[PDB]
A paper describes a structure:
In Gram-positive pathogens such as [name] (Sa) and Enterococcus faecalis (Ef), the pleiotropic transcription factor [name] plays a key role in integrating metabolism and virulence factor expression. [name] DNA-binding is activated by two types of ligands: branched chain amino acids (BCAAs, i.e. isoleucine, leucine, and valine) and, in most cases, guanosine triphosphate, GTP. Each 30 kDa protomer comprises the N-terminal ligand-binding domain called GAF (cGMP-specific phosphodiesterases, adenylyl cyclases and FhlA). The GAF domain is connected by an extended linker helix to the C-terminal DNA-binding (DBD) domain that contains a winged helix-turn-helix (wHTH) motif.
Unexpectedly however, the structures revealed a previously undescribed monomeric form of SaCodY and a dimeric EfCodY. Nevertheless, ligand-free SaCodY can also form dimers, as confirmed with SEC-MALS. This suggests that a monomer–dimer equilibrium may be a factor in regulation of SaCodY activity. The asymmetric unit of the ligand-free SaCodY crystals contains two well-structured monomers with their GAF and DBD domains tightly packed head-to-tail. Therefore, it is possible that the dimer observed in the SEC-MALS experiments of ligand-free SaCodY is the non-biological head-to-tail dimer observed in the crystals. To determine if the DBD domain of ligand-free SaCodY is flexible in solution, we used hydrogen deuterium exchange mass spectrometry, which did show the DBD domain to be flexible. In more detail, in absence of ligands, Arg69 in the H3–H4 linker, extends its side chain into the vacant Ile binding site making a hydrogen bond to the main chain carbonyl group of Val97. In the ligand-free structure, elevated B-factors suggest that the H1-H2 loop region (residues Leu14-Phe24) has increased flexibility. Superimposition of monomeric ligand-free and dimeric-activated SaGAF domains shows that residues Gln15-Lys18 in the ligand-free domain cause steric clashes with the linker helix and S3–S4 loop of protomer B. This may explain the monomeric state of ligand-free SaCodY.
Author numbering: 1 to 256
């Protein structure tokens, strides 16, 4: 398979399509199969977002050892310190991604490390490994492109995650601030009865058993609904369905 053929595969298979969430496991398999390598996609903090081995090796002993090994966190955390592309790293190098014990099976291994950059910040690391062969200039071009694509998908993922967490934290703080002292106490009792974050509430009956008025319960939920912390729905002449939408709300509430 020629350089231009490999490029077509990666353009067609890695392209972001509307309606699809990025699956880093499947990204690693595409890279592994196109470039004939073992692939490890590592977040900036060292989490293995996705991996795939080149299972087309002749030696079942090598395959089984790679299948059995879990990349240590000590290694993945070192990758952040690699600031530029390091290619054709040998087995004696501390940056090798291959197992350290059986030096003779991996004596000819090469590791290549690509920093994944996005918006002027480190987003993660792409690590490629080969048991017997070198990374030539065509291989490095394909590796860099893969790293570029992954960075764009992480960047979109992180952008939306930071915005969501901020939206949730603002909603919780505004909900908690808008609650009176009695309304706060009622919410604590409400979720003490529901035994969780979701369930059916019979306000009148629960108000009776806790020594609180139905009006206080109703107003407290109304403020949480207005803040977007929960959703509420009456289920008939009695009963209200309650679901917390901000997971960290109750934890933050008790801190108030």
């Amino acid at each position: 398979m020629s350089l231009l053929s490999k490029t077509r595969e990666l353009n067609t298979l890695l392209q972001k399509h509307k309606g699809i969430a990025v699956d880093f496991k499947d990204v690693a398999q595409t890279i592994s199969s196109v470039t004939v390598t073992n692939v490890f996609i590592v977040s900036r903090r060292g989490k293995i977002l996705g991996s795939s081995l080149n299972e087309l090796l002749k030696s079942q002993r090598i395959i089984q050892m790679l299948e059995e090994r879990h990349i240590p966190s000590e290694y993945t955390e070192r990758l952040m310190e690699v600031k530029q592309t390091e290619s054709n790293i040998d087995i004696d190098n501390v940056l090798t991604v291959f197992p350290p014990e059986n030096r003779e099976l991996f004596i000819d291994s090469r590791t290549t490390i690509f920093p994944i950059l996005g918006g002027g910040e480190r987003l993660g690391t792409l690590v490629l490994g080969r048991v017997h062969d070198d990374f030539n200039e065509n291989d490095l071009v394909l590796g860099e492109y893969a790293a570029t694509v992954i960075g764009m998908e992480i960047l979109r993922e992180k952008h939306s995650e930071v915005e969501k967490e901020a939206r949730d934290k603002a909603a919780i703080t505004m909900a908690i601030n808008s609650l009176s002292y009695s309304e706060k106490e009622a919410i604590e009792h409400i979720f003490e009865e529901l035994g969780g974050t979701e369930g059916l509430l019979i306000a009148s009956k629960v108000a009776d058993r806790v020594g609180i008025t139905r009006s206080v319960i109703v107003n407290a939920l109304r403020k949480l609904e207005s803040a977007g912390v929960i959703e509420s729905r009456s289920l008939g002449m009695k009963g209200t369905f309650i679901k917390v939408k901000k997971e960290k709300f109750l934890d933050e509430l008790e801190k108030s």
